[PDB]
Design a protein around this ligand. Structure first.
Ligand SMILES: *[C@@H]1O[C@H](CO)[C@@H](O[C@@H]2O[C@H](CO)[C@@H](O)[C@H](O)[C@H]2NC(C)=O)[C@H](O)[C@H]1NC(C)=O
Ligand SMILES: *[C@@H]1O[C@H](CO)[C@@H](O)[C@H](O)[C@H]1NC(C)=O
Ligand SMILES: *[C@@H]1O[C@H](CO)[C@@H](O)[C@H](O)[C@H]1NC(C)=O
Ligand SMILES: *[C@@H]1O[C@H](CO)[C@@H](O)[C@H](O)[C@H]1NC(C)=O
Ligand SMILES: *[C@@H]1O[C@H](CO)[C@@H](O)[C@H](O)[C@H]1NC(C)=O
Lengths: 277, 108, 296, 123, 49, 108
């Protein structure tokens, strides 16, 4: 589609495999903001956005957070906190005509810069001056849309390019686009190294009836510490307790007198670790 | 008008040989060349679109190269199913889709 | 469509909102803590427009709507959201009819008085045409009967980040012509993933005219201090900018304050306008000579 | 897996017209360009005409300008080629090829062909 | 220099603009209009940039 | 086949003059031209390999330029040891190492 009519495809309920995308060599630009492409396999996302459009060659750099430009301001705007990846490739073999492909339009003038991630469809005649247009193009009446002159004979920097950007959003929702990872059997009441839909961490998975949790998944404490989590496979309320901490204090007389010590682990009920309590 | 030329006329090789078919364009076409394998008994097929891009569905034994006014096509083995006529087509100039002459390949 | 004009002209009434309109802002479980959050909330003791006779005009949709209704026969069926509502722009439709909950995002042709007539319901004359349909959704099957007040239903609608969020709650009440003074927590119900542009909305009603009324309130960004009990449910809340005592409670992070003097915020006089003073020179800079030169 | 079968080959006098068709079944016909190719009995391939994915851009070879009118029918996956004022040099073999893109003038070339239908221009 | 040179070997004309800002009266300003002056009123003033 | 052409035929100058010898290629050769100074009494030598790269061992007075289908060679002084015949050779097309005709230079 065109710049001012960029498509947006909803992606959900996926066993998403990004390895085939990474290993493909048909993409000239492969840049990701905030996520390592090799690490895309294990992560789980609640939703994925795929936006596709076609722009000029020199504007591939303009697609980035905190960037300014005609298309950046009047056609397409990226949030400053954007996370995801950007994919773009040349399309001379498909989107070029010797007579000039006139099917691609982009906006020239508008009242003010548009907010990030919003679409403009209205094709009203721009009022560049004071003379009322009244739907009639003329002086002080510029049509905001211009058509790209894409031809196979044009320069490399001017060539048409197809742009597809992937944006990943994460929040406290059940993730539905996960990667090809096998879920293992559950083991509780032991110090394990769990992973609940990307929620990494260590601890012991005791069974606790914390509350009903009719629609909630996570449980938090004073700090950003997930206390209780809801299983993704079945529906039960597990409880996270960190492993045992403490300190090793050494009780010793003077090394001049003798060579003996006595170790003290404070705040440790060492039924699990001449034993004293 | 653009003239599209074929340097070889007829080639012969073996089942374990390696030959190169070259196609020269009078005017620059900027890597926009295509190669077709026209079996005389059935419909022709496509091997390489663009200068050096290999279409899915044919063995990776074939390999193309060249840009501007000089191009080349090579076959690494010439297996017993590769006897056919090969054409080079340009898709960049105003005369639409000018084909070059044939190049018969009989292995013996 | 069908026009009904036997509607007496009444100015909308007003009522005190009291402390209604507090919902769970997220899906994380917290218990026995005092959490301060910033979100679109209904201000405490706000002004609520009161409608009754058949009264269902077009109402704006600025940032959210607190929709409340107390009835005995469930006259209200659903809601209509949109901008033009004449197949010129995409519009939202919700109908909780006698069959089930149906949600559609198709472009309809709405007349000047979309309404349902009815004991059995036969007349379905809310719209005439529908085209370019995009989304649909139906909930689980359930049947509901068509025949002072006993129950109160309150809803909150939000439209942000291309998501249509609906929060709901249903509680019994013994009041008739007054809104209850108390607290009720609203839990999320559905989160429609559809990016519609909504500015106006209207309500549907289901000849015989019934005695019922619904209340409308508007949300705006406010800071709230929420209290969770031992079971993780909201028990009390403080509108944090209602009055200076509320500001003191926010600073101390508690619902009780001892005798003393406390510092809450800082007062700052705001500017009224701006002035620009530049010298009045009108000659243009010689940029043509620099650029349009022949020999460098 | 795609099928391209033509018709309309026969014997006609010089200056007389005859009508071609070509049936496509193995793909989606509504979003690809189509071409006609000519194979002389004792010469190589030659391009004749092409049409876009929709009836917008149409190009003809220099030697067949003003004589051929390539049509298209997206409803039943079938294209046409009306040849008028045939001469003796038009007794070649005509193929019904398919373009990889959606435009009549692109580096995209012909991926799939079909068995031709032989025509003769003689008395 | 010749017209037959390669693209990388062609002559190029270079013009560089440099701005200096310091404790001096600004003399090269943009096309900005000047409004009236109001006294005894909290305002956002802009005096020579 | 590629045809390689010499615009001048015979030139005359002085000990303090400056002349330019130009060589045109029918087809683009992409800056792959060579210049040789063939003294008629002994073996020829090389002056400039490539378009404008000067070989070590000869004075920097000579200078070459050109790319594509247009090339030029110039001598700044034409000193009394520069009377010879100059050839332009292409090394880019399929016919290997096609030489252009001579260009006699007699200073008088
Ligand atoms: C001299 O420079 C000026 C501005 O630097 C050029 O003026 C503009 O040139 C563009 C391109 O030709 C026109 O579209 C504008 O209408 C011109 N504006 C004005 C106010 O003249 C001017 O073209 C330059 N002169 C030359 C010969 O190139
Ligand atoms: C998926 O998990 C649910 C949880 O109980 C289970 O009922 C179902 O059989 C599982 N399906 C597969 C294919 O493992
Ligand atoms: C240590 O653990 C044992 C058994 O787990 C328990 O009986 C004892 O009371 C614990 N110590 C303290 C100080 O509570
Ligand atoms: C509601 O608004 C009306 C008019 O703006 C005003 O007269 C009335 O006092 C308001 N309600 C309250 C409770 O202040
Ligand atoms: C929590 O729920 C229990 C029911 O199991 C109830 O007895 C208790 O009163 C509730 N907590 C509060 C603070 O009301």
């Amino acid at each position: 589609a065109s710049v001012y009519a960029w498509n947006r495809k909803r992606i959900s309920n996926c066993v998403a495999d990004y390895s085939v995308l990474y290993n493909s060599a048909s993409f000239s630009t492969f840049k990701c903001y905030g996520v390592s492409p090799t690490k895309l396999n294990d992560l789980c996302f609640t939703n994925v956005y795929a936006d596709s459009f076609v722009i000029r060659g020199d504007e591939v750099r303009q697609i980035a957070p905190g960037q300014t430009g005609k298309i950046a301001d009047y056609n397409y705007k990226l949030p400053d906190d954007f996370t995801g990846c950007v994919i773009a490739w040349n399309s001379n073999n498909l989107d070029s005509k010797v007579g000039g492909n006139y099917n691609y339009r982009y906006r020239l003038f508008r009242k003010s810069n548009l907010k990030p991630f919003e679409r403009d469809i209205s094709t009203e005649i721009y009022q560049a001056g004071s003379k009322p247009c009244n739907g009639v193009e003329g002086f002080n009446c510029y049509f905001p849309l211009q058509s790209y002159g894409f031809q196979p004979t044009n320069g490399v920097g001017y060539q048409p390019y197809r742009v597809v950007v992937l944006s990943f959003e994460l929040l406290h929702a059940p993730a539905t686009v996960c990667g090809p990872k096998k879920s293992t059997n559950l083991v509780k009441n032991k110090c394990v190294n769990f992973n609940f839909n990307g929620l990494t961490g260590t601890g012991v998975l005791t069974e606790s009836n914390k509350k009903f949790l009719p629609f909630q998944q996570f449980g938090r404490d004073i700090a950003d510490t997930t206390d209780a989590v809801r299983d993704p496979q079945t529906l039960e309320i597990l409880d996270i307790t960190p492993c045992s901490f403490g300190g090793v204090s050494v009780i010793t007389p003077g090394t001049n007198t003798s060579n003996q010590v006595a170790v003290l682990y404070q705040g440790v009920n060492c039924t699990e670790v001449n034993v004293f309590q | 008008d653009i003239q599209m030329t074929q340097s070889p006329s007829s080639l012969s090789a073996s089942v374990g040989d390696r030959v190169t078919i070259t196609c020269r364009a009078s005017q620059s076409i900027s890597s926009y060349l295509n190669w077709f394998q026209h079996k005389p008994g059935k419909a022709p097929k496509l091997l390489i679109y663009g200068a050096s891009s290999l279409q899915s569905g044919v063995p990776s034994r074939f390999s193309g190269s060249g840009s501007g006014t000089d191009f080349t096509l090579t076959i690494s083995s010439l297996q017993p199913e590769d006897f056919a006529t090969y054409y080079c087509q340009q898709s960049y100039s105003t005369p639409p889709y000018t084909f070059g002459q044939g190049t018969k390949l009989e292995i013996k | 469509c069908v026009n009904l004009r036997t509607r007496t002209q009444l100015p909308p009434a007003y009522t005190n909102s009291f402390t209604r309109g507090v919902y769970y802002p997220d899906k994380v479980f917290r218990s026995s803590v005092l959490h301060s959050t910033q979100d679109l909330f209904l201000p405490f003791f706000s002004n609520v427009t009161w409608f009754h006779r058949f009264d269902n005009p077009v109402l704006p949709f600025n940032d959210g709507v607190y929709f409340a209704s107390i009835e005995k026969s469930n006259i209200i069926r659903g809601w209509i959201f949109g901008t033009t509502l004449d197949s010129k722009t995409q519009s939202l439709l919700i109908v909780n009819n006698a069959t089930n909950v149906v949600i559609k995002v198709c472009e309809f042709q709405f007349c000047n008085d979309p309404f349902l007539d009815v004991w059995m319901e036969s007349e379905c004359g809310v719209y005439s045409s529908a085209n370019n349909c995009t989304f649909e959704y139906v909930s689980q099957p359930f049947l509901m009967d068509l025949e002072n007040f006993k129950n109160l239903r309150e809803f909150v609608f939000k439209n942000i980040d291309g998501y249509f969020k609906i929060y709901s709650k249903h509680t019994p009440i013994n009041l008739v012509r007054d809104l209850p003074q108390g607290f009720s927590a609203l839990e999320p119900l559905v989160d429609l993933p559809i990016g519609i542009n909504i500015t106006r909305f209207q309500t549907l009603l289901a000849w015989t005219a019934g005695a019922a009324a619904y209340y409308v309130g508007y949300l705006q960004p406010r800071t709230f201090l929420l209290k969770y009990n031992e079971n993780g449910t909201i028990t009390d809340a403080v509108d944090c900018a209602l009055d200076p005592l509320s500001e003191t409670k926010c600073t101390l992070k508690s619902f009780t304050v001892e005798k003393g003097i406390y510092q809450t915020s800082n007062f700052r006089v705001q500017p009224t306008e701006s002035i620009v003073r530049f010298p009045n020179i009108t000659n243009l800079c010689p940029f043509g000579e620099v650029f349009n030169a022949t020999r460098f | 897996e795609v099928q391209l079968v033509e018709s309309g080959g026969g014997l006609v006098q010089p200056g007389r017209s005859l009508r071609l068709s070509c049936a496509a079944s193995g793909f989606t016909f509504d979003d690809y360009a189509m071409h006609w190719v000519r194979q002389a009995p004792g010469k190589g391939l030659e391009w004749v005409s092409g049409i876009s994915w929709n009836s917008d851009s149409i190009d003809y070879a220099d030697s067949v300008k003003g004589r051929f009118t390539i049509s298209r029918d997206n409803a039943k996956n079938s294209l046409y080629l009306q040849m008028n004022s045939l001469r003796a040099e038009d007794t070649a073999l005509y193929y019904c090829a398919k373009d990889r893109g959606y435009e009549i003038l692109t580096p995209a070339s012909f991926d799939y062909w079909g068995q031709g239908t032989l025509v003769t221009v003689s008395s």
